[PDB]
Design a protein around this nucleic acid. Structure first.
Length: 205
RNA sequence: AUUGAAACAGGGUCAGCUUGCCGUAGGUGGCAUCGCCCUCGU
């Protein structure tokens, strides 16, 4: 397995049912962690899998608004001239978040030639130590860069083990199956968050 | 393959045009620095 910790000032993970005016989750998204790992090192033969997620500091809100346009650009058009399109939008940003993750990975069907578990693990350790990636992982939006330190266990502020509130059902991931290469179309798996005392545990199917 | 991807609170708006701190009213009226002693004695 692997244990990593992420830190940053600001972070939103928007629920679906309010996507129009942002209402971020309280906790991080199990789907999000998958992509955060993939950000460091993407191969077409690796399938990630998240096991444990740990909060570190108490949740804290702030609110914000800025000016937006809501027209996806198209080839037939020449430009946008945003003045004729603006839709002010609001947002519910989490503040001062650092999270801890326990996760591992397995192999896809297309193992390929250099399908060595050990070499992938080794190069992952290398990239984690030196700070290597395709791109800086977001925190739900491109503007909130995060910072990740590869640690073994208990190398940050003591986890906030306090029993916290429920959250009902929560977004899990988005299936890739019925889609060919390049995710033609997808459905939405869910799960039950069920208010883990401190360590939220991602159950597989 | 992050409910992600692209997303200006923007564009300008004098605190201004003016009015006496003035017109007078006393420091007055009146009380002796006095009353007194050697520079002798060769």
């Amino acid at each position: 397995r692997f244990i990593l910790e992420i830190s940053g000032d600001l972070a939103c993970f928007t629920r679906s049912e309010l996507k129009v005016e942002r209402v971020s989750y309280p906790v991080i998204t199990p789907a999000a962690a998958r992509n955060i790992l993939m950000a460091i090192l993407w191969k077409p033969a690796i399938r990630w899998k998240v096991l444990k997620i740990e909060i570190l500091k108490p949740i804290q809100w702030t609110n914000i608004r800025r000016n937006e346009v809501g027209t996806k650009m198209s080839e037939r058009s020449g430009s946008l001239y945003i003045e004729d399109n603006r839709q002010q939008r609001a947002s519910m940003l989490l503040k001062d978040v650092a999270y801890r993750i326990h996760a591992d990975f397995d192999m896809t069907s297309e193992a390929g030639e250099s399908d060595n578990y050990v070499k992938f693990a080794e190069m992952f350790k290398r990239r984690a130590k030196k700070g290597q990636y395709f791109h800086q992982p977001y925190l739900g939006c491109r503007e909130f860069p995060c910072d990740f330190r590869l640690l073994e266990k208990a190398e940050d502020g003591l986890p906030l083990e306090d029993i916290t509130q429920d959250f009902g059902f929560m977004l899990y991931d988005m299936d890739f199956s019925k889609s060919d290469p390049r995710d033609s179309n997808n459905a939405e798996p869910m799960f039950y968050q069920c208010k883990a005392v401190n360590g939220v545990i991602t159950v597989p199917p």
